[PDB]
Write a protein that binds this ligand. Structure first.
Ligand SMILES: C[As](C)(=O)[O-]
Ligand SMILES: [Zn+2]
Ligand SMILES: [Zn+2]
Ligand SMILES: [Zn+2]
Ligand SMILES: [Zn+2]
Length: 207
């Protein structure tokens, strides 16, 4: 059994992707029979608004996972500490943000392990369970290697960057001055429709 190395770009999700994720420790949705939803952010760059996002999440008591890179950890230690201190989960977005399908196995292991160890040493978060691949690029091989190292492969069902359903995993952004306002409105609006904002730990328990 040679794992396939053909690259795929995540988007939404079809039989191929569905079963690739299912067999290799991946998910992109939670339970679709409950109105629980899951906010996530990717943090490979700091645009200057993450503190304002964090302020909104604290005000609204909404948990999120922030998938961080090594560049982000080294350059934004104070924001990282806010993430841990204010009840969020810090996820793994790789050290240098390469496409996982373009690197050798030794390099992929270093790219994940370096971030995991840095998150644990810098913030004291106990476990780093969640990986989101750079650019949502994956193969059968990269999914399987990531799972073997003890991580879930966490994709998304809705992304919004200015150019909802039960179980949605949202990938939102902190790119401009107005994003914090939009987030606050979205949280309020979705709660009025009966949605509950939960953590990726809750997702796993939702079974
Ligand atoms: C899926 As991305 C553009 O946050 O690496
Ligand atoms: Zn609920
Ligand atoms: Zn850097
Ligand atoms: Zn990224
Ligand atoms: Zn994005």
């Amino acid at each position: 059994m040679a794992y396939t190395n053909t690259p795929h770009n995540w988007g939404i999700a079809g039989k191929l992707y569905t079963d690739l994720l299912q067999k290799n420790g991946g998910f992109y949705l939670g339970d679709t029979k409950k109105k629980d939803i899951y906010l996530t952010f990717d943090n490979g760059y700091e645009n200057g608004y993450t503190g304002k996002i964090l302020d909104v999440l604290k005000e609204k008591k909404v948990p999120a996972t922030f998938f961080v890179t090594g560049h982000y950890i080294k350059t934004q230690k104070d924001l990282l500490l806010r993430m841990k201190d204010e009840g969020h989960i810090i996820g793994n977005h790789s050290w240098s943000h390469p496409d996982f399908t373009a690197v050798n196995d030794e390099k992929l292991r270093e790219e994940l392990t370096s971030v995991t160890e840095e998150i644990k040493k810098v913030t004291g978060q106990k476990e780093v369970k969640y990986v989101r691949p750079p650019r949502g690029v994956f193969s059968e091989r990269t999914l399987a290697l990531t799972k073997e190292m003890g991580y879930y492969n966490v994709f998304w069902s809705l992304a919004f960057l200015d150019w909802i359903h039960p179980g949605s995993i949202l990938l939102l952004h902190a790119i401009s001055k107005d994003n914090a306002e939009a987030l606050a409105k979205i949280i309020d609006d979705l709660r009025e429709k009966g949605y509950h904002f939960k953590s990726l730990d809750d997702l796993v328990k939702s079974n």
